[PDB]
Amino acid sequence: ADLEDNMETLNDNLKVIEKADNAAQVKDALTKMAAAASDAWSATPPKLEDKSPDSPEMHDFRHGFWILIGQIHDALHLANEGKVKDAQEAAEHLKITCNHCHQKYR
Amino acid sequence: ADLEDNMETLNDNLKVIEKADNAAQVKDALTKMAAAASDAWSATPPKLEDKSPDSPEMHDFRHGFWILIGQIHDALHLANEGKVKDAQEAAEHLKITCNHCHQKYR
Amino acid sequence: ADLEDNMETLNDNLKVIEKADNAAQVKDALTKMAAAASDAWSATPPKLEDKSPDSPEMHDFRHGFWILIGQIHDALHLANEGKVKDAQEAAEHLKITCNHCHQKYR
Amino acid sequence: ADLEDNMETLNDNLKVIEKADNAAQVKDALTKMAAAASDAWSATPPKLEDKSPDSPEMHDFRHGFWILIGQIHDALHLANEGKVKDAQEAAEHLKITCNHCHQKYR
Ligand code: HEC
Ligand code: HEC
Ligand code: HEC
Ligand code: HEC
Ligand SMILES: [Cl-]
Ligand SMILES: [Cl-]
Ligand SMILES: [Zn+2]
Ligand SMILES: [Zn+2]
Ligand SMILES: [Zn+2]
Ligand SMILES: [Zn+2]
Ligand SMILES: [Zn+2]
Ligand SMILES: [Zn+2]
Ligand SMILES: [Zn+2]
Ligand SMILES: [Zn+2]
Ligand SMILES: [Zn+2]
């Protein structure tokens, strides 16, 4: 999908996690976020259309998605241990990564 | 594009890394492998077309790409520090992940 | 040495990172924090002296130090690439992990 | 403990994992390996007594224990999902990290 669609997927599923009651909802939202992050890894954001794909900027840009993917990976493991509250708390971790990339690149 | 194309990208660039002389070659090959792994994350492999997308198998399948992506992430950091030999020996780490997924699902 | 000493090491060096100007200061503070986190991994915190060492609590407790160690690991890689501001903003990531463990066990 | 004691702990528990029948044995061995790796993070190995503690060598040395700690972290998550075979296969991952550090530093 395009960067904007992936971002709406990330935004909708982050809310599902913050509002969730059971593990299955959290697991499903985390899996959908991981798919959106991986698909978004390739995208060139507007602020960086001018820059070459192996510029310092596009490397740092892509590095943000590695942070997020890793955070989702750990969150799903916690979710798969019945630790709903601990997996929901991952949301707080994910939001930092969301804001850090936004601050630099949208 | 498809799982088989992503795999040939992973295979070709793994060899480039093993036969590389300088950092730029290693960096470029690692970046291409990361793109292939991320793009492959969503694929349903032939031996798992029968299985449900939330089966233990498709979860374990996807988990393999998280391991590889994480390994590529660290390898590129080492590559970006001029540690060519340390980044090349990441290749040895990557091959274990290649074989583990292949053993179960190829 | 003890959990409280490790925590003051983490606290002092987190501030050094937030107020740093150059890479060497950030690198040095991150290295000291990594040493404190690793050394703290084995500690039994007061609020968990009652609990068995393989309880869900002491496992979750130890898991917190794995998150922090991983965050410090990535921060030092960024620091070693001359990306001072990117390494300093790791501080924001670290504080979430500090608070999550404190909320449950301090 | 000293580096040699930590190494014997790593060696004994790696064998327990390769020989294990149930999750509890694997979980317990992984937890003991994590404790040994964290405690070993601080050690100065013989080949590097001459070198300063913030030399490139002692940084690369310590980086090896970050790889191992991360690998143990993932292995324990797999172990905590009843995936004994998948957690035992982590052993193959750990041995690469063992050999890579040995090759450079013992
Ligand atoms: C980069 C590494 C990013 C990460 C990680 C996250 N986001 Fe993002 N997001 C990013 C960019 C470059 C853009 C702009 C895209 C454009 O074409 O304009 C966005 C946009 C959004 C939006 C759209 C709203 C807007 O103000 O433009 C949303 C709703 C959004 N992002 C949400 C979001 C969430 C929830 C994230 C983590 C869970 C997240 N983003 C991470 C770049 C990056
Ligand atoms: C799963 C998580 C995998 C990881 C990690 C890696 N590979 Fe793979 N690979 C996988 C599957 C399911 C398949 C078969 C797909 C099919 O349609 O039949 C493959 C296949 C390959 C191939 C052969 C491709 C072909 O021409 O048919 C190669 C050469 C290959 N894989 C290489 C490779 C390398 C080098 C990897 C890591 C560096 C790697 N793979 C990881 C599943 C998975
Ligand atoms: C658990 C996994 C923790 C993480 C991660 C961090 N901290 Fe911590 N901290 C923890 C405990 C259990 C305690 C209480 C110990 C006790 O004996 O009562 C603390 C305490 C602190 C303190 C106060 C120390 C004192 O003088 O009594 C500080 C200032 C502190 N912690 C800071 C801190 C920082 C900055 C962290 C991350 C960067 C951090 N802690 C992580 C448990 C855990
Ligand atoms: C460095 C980052 C290391 C990692 C990771 C592992 N090992 Fe190690 N090991 C290391 C050093 C520097 C030494 C030498 C210590 C000395 O004072 O001589 C060792 C030693 C051992 C030994 C002792 C046998 C010997 O030939 O000296 C064993 C049995 C051993 N190490 C096992 C081991 C295992 C099983 C590991 C991973 C699971 C492992 N080591 C990782 C440095 C490092
Ligand atoms: Cl980030
Ligand atoms: Cl290694
Ligand atoms: Zn929506
Ligand atoms: Zn974890
Ligand atoms: Zn899992
Ligand atoms: Zn960040
Ligand atoms: Zn594609
Ligand atoms: Zn690293
Ligand atoms: Zn980088
Ligand atoms: Zn594996
Ligand atoms: Zn101590």
Ligand SMILES: [Zn+2]
């Ligand atoms: Zn990184």
Ligand SMILES: [Zn+2]
């Ligand atoms: Zn380094």
Ligand SMILES: [Zn+2]
């Ligand atoms: Zn947390």
Ligand SMILES: [Zn+2]
């Ligand atoms: Zn022994």
Ligand SMILES: [Zn+2]
């Ligand atoms: Zn995992």
Ligand SMILES: [Zn+2]
């Ligand atoms: Zn756990």
Ligand SMILES: [Zn+2]
């Ligand atoms: Zn290695």
